Amino acid sequence: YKPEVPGNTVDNWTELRASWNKERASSLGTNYYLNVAVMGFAYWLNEAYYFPPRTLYVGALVFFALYVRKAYFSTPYAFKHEY
């Protein structure tokens, strides 16, 4: 016995193709912007190490809850001709 793949093959393969019909950007922009963000604004966290631990833990959970994943990322703005 083997389980059946759910769905239709044409519809599943169109789902697999979606949002990838675009040339991928080079990674130099992401890396340069990350380095600029760290070298310019990471000193804002110097006093944060002394803040109460409930605040630090809730802030860490908030950063995890609002994080957007870089892999498999897509925007509807990539395929529209006006804002």
Partner: peptide, 21 residues
């Protein structure tokens, strides 16, 4: 047929994302 939610689906998505474009 490939499930787009499974790990095989993510393999096909990676191939479409990186190789074909």
């Amino acid at each position: 047929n490939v499930d787009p939610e499974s790990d095989d689906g993510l393999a096909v998505k990676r191939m479409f994302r990186d190789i074909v474009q």
